[PDB]
Amino acid sequence: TIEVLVTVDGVNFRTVVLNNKNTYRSQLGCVFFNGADISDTIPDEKQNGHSLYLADNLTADETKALKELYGPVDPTFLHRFYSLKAAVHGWKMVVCDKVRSLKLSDNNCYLNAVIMTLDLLKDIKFVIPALQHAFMKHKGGDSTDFIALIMAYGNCTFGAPDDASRLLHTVLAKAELCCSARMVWREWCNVCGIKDVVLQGLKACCYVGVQTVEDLRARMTYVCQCGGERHRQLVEHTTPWLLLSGTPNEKLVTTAPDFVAFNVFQGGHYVHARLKLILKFDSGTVSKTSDWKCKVTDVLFPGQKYSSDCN
């Protein structure tokens, strides 16, 4: 018979007794050993004393320690996340002039878009401990845990292509700002009245629907639920950075504007670019250009310090 150590956090361990009659999965459950899923194998003596990472059939304790480490997750999360880690350890990172980019493999071009964007976002951190720990590992130079994690939270699938902007939302939905940020929208209807809509922190740094600063600070017009001519305009905006993102939009980018970076969608393919002339990163292969015809999807602007007296 066999006794091994079972953990879900690499901190808390319990001993489980195993025979070598049936498989790990049948006796115990989904178990990973040194990255490998060995649920459907026979317990060997050489696997004795060593530590396993359990993925299902958790105790009430382990379940609680899971929800504190990863937040509230579905019963298939841990297996999916562990599986993804094994799937993506083969992936490689290119480093061109102290800039890290994700080499192309298994249609992971969108993950190159997400991560190269996130590496520019200043003063962000994640509330979920495991994600924040992975994030600090990623900036440290080891990105396997992080890449795997956001694929897990994003319900992605290995190999399958995916919407980069959808993912950059899910990830940012779990982050927060380590500083001050303010965004005030001012609506008004003559029968209904003036109304100020306020956003603080991260939500004040990211908008979906418009691709540039200009179309953002513009006066919208529509119909109030009151039943008349309603208006809308951004009157206050203070950020360390601004992330605007919309559907793929064809245009010519010239280099001197004030973007800092942006993503492009070709076709099912993503590219990330910066402005230090235009530098582009097509998943490892770096290029320099002075102008580009492309379908921009997300744009990154520097810190906003803007006020409008609204006339």
Q: Please enumerate, by residue number, every residue annotated as part of a binding site for Zn(2+).
A: 30, 56, 79, 189, 192, 224, 226
Which listed range, 101-109, 155-163, 182-190, 286-294, lies at the site for Zn ion (CB under 5 A)?
Answer: 182-190
Six-digit token string for 241 = 């950075």
Question: What is the smallest separation between the CB atom of 186 and Zn ion, expressed in angstroms?
Answer: 14
Which residues partner with 16 through β-bridges? 4
CA–CA gap between residue 300 and residue 133 (Å, rounded): 25
Question: What is the smallest separation between the CB atom of 210 and Zn ion, expressed in angstroms?
Answer: 24
Instruction: Please give the residues from 229 up to 288 whose contact with Zn ion meets the rule CB under 5 A.
Output: none
Name the amino acid, one letter, at 233.
Q
54, 7 Cβ separation under 8 angstroms: yes
CB nearer Zn ion, residue 42 or residue 192: 192
224 lies in the site for Zn ion, by CB under 5 A: yes
3-state secondary structure of 216: helix
CB nearer Zn ion, residue 220 or residue 286: 220
3-state secondary structure of 227: coil
User: What angle is formed at CA 88 by the lines to CA 104 and CA 94, rounded to 5 degrees?
Assistant: 40
Which listed range, 63-71, 220-228, 278-286, 301-309, lies at the site for Zn ion (CB under 5 A)?
Answer: 220-228
Instruction: Please give the residues from 197 up to 216 whose contact with Zn ion meets the rule CB under 5 A.
Output: none
3-state secondary structure of 192: coil
Q: How many C-beta atoms lie closer than 10 Å to residue 293's C-beta?
A: 9
CB nearer Zn ion, residue 189 or residue 204: 189
189 lies in the site for Zn ion, by CB under 5 A: yes
Cα–Cα distances in Å, from 24 out to 38, 48, 81, 84, 288? 7, 13, 19, 20, 53
CB nearer Zn ion, residue 36 or residue 191: 191
- DSSP E strands in 255-302: the ranges are 261-265, 270-275, 278-282, 285-289, 291-302
192 lies in the site for Zn ion, by CB under 5 A: yes
Question: What is the smallest separation between the CB atom of 86 and Zn ion, expressed in angstroms?
Answer: 57
Question: What is the smallest separation between the CB atom of 88 and Zn ion, expressed in angstroms?
Answer: 52
CB nearer Zn ion, residue 16 or residue 192: 192
Q: Which residues of the shown chain bind Zn ion in the complex (CB under 5 A)? A: 189, 191-192, 224, 226
